Amino acid sequence: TGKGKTLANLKLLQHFGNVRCSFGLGMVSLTKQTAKQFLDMGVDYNSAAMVTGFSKSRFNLGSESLDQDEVSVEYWGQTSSLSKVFPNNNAGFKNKKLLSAPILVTTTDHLVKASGVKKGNKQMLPYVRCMHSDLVLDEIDDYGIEDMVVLARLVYLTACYGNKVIISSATITPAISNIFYEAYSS
């Protein structure tokens, strides 16, 4: 920690060319931190899309003009061609930010539904998202055991279409690193 892991992940993604990735992170605030790093280093909202699907009421006080912080939800971005095959032209704000994002800095639960769902059509949007985009999962050790199982299911599904999985965990256990490699290998 403290060495700039997420910046190194973006560097590794950009080494192969232009970036198309889903930064799936635990917690809302860690996604906010990675979004703020992406904003102040080089990434605008035409490429980045911070997705936290709860609409929290945590606002910044003191000075709105002198903030230079509090990464928000606008996504000027670019609507992908996949929105025409989704129901009713995808959706409003949230699913447009999901599907059409080049870089999707999101909470992870908007990506683990790609592996499948019980009832409804909630699988298709993260499925089609992870089909054409890379997957970057940071500090996977903080998740639960079943959470890590479904995250490696997501890694297997992402590798099923040739995309690249970046795992960023310092305290990795050989077991975890191995089963994530075996999911990527399958």
């Binding site: 920690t1 403290g2 635990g26 917690m27 605030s29 860690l30 931190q33 929290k56 009421s57 945590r58 639960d109 683990v112 539904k113 592996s115 499948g116 769902v117 019980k118 500090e139 050790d141 903080d142 639960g144 055991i145 079943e146 959470d147 890590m148 199982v149 479904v150 490696a152 299911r153 297997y156 310092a170 305290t171 990795i172 256990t173 050989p174 077991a175 975890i176 089963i179 075996e182 999911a183 399958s186």
Partner: protein
């Protein structure tokens, strides 16, 4: 510490603790109202930032003071905090490594004697001596430690880093915490398909990997909501001990997440420490 009532027990003991030290106590668990919780976060991030000396102005560093933050595993995940020292209630070894990462995270000065004091037992030993590390840990009913003494299951003096988690040991998992951790990790995330496993094949066709392997599997979790100072369910606001509280932010809106088990009794929300059993 491990859980919320454990945190308020450590807080209520330390507040009533007579000493010459100027203890200033904070509670940092997850059961808090929208406003109060967010306020704790921003304050803690701006006082524990030790890459510069900007914090000297967010706390009273003029007077010798012990600024103590009693927290649950919400501090060891995703927090850019830098404490001078930590006292850890043992639940898992990755908790030890992460709370080591909350001490001297921003500085580079080496400690001289000892900067982490690990407790002898988790507090669930006095409540359940059969199993005590299952809360926020990989101990469970199928993987039981033979002894719960941390002299038996951990090194008495140890340089805590990622090395013990990085190495990986499957032998002697019943009397060491690290090998207990590694055992569970290879016995649940295995190269099989099972039904709740990771290579799942044949079952993707079925609804089984989405029912028996539930993402964010938590307890029932109902949400008692504070509406403008007036609580919804069986909450009953209370008064904290006002002995050593350094900072206490008030809250009026927001919601608290209470497990259905603790819904039976009053969660007794308080401005200083959120939920407990009283």
């Amino acid at each position: 510490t491990t859980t919320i009532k454990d945190c308020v027990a450590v807080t209520q003991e330390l507040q009533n603790w007579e000493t010459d030290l100027s203890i200033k106590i904070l509670c940092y668990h997850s059961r808090f109202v929208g406003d109060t919780k967010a306020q704790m976060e921003e304050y803690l991030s701006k006082v524990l930032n030790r890459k510069g000396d900007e914090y000297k102005k967010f706390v009273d560093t003029t007077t010798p003071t012990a600024y103590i933050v009693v927290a649950t595993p919400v501090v060891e995940v995703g927090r850019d905090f830098d404490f001078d020292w930590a006292i850890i209630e043992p639940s898992s070894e990755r908790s030890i490594v992460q709370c080591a990462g909350r001490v001297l995270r921003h500085r580079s000065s080496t400690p001289t004697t000892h900067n982490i004091h690990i407790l002898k037992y988790p507090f669930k030993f006095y409540r359940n001596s059969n199993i005590c590390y299952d809360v926020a840990g990989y101990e469970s009913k199928g993987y039981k430690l033979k002894s719960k003494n941390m002299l038996d299951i951990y090194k008495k003096e140890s340089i805590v880093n990622s090395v013990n988690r990085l190495q990986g040991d499957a032998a002697f998992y019943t009397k060491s915490l690290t090998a207990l951790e590694h055992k569970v990790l290879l016995d649940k995330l295995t190269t099989d398909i099972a039904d709740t496993n990771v290579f799942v094949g044949g079952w993707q066709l079925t609804a089984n990997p989405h029912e028996y392997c539930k993402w964010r599997r938590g307890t029932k979790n109902e949400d008692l909501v504070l509406t403008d100072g007036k609580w919804s369910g069986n909450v009953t606001t209370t008064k904290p001990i006002q002995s050593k509280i350094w900072r206490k932010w008030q809250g009026e809106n927001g919601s608290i997440t209470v497990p259905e088990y603790l819904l039976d009794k009053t969660i007794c929300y308080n401005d200083f420490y959120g939920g407990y059993e009283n």
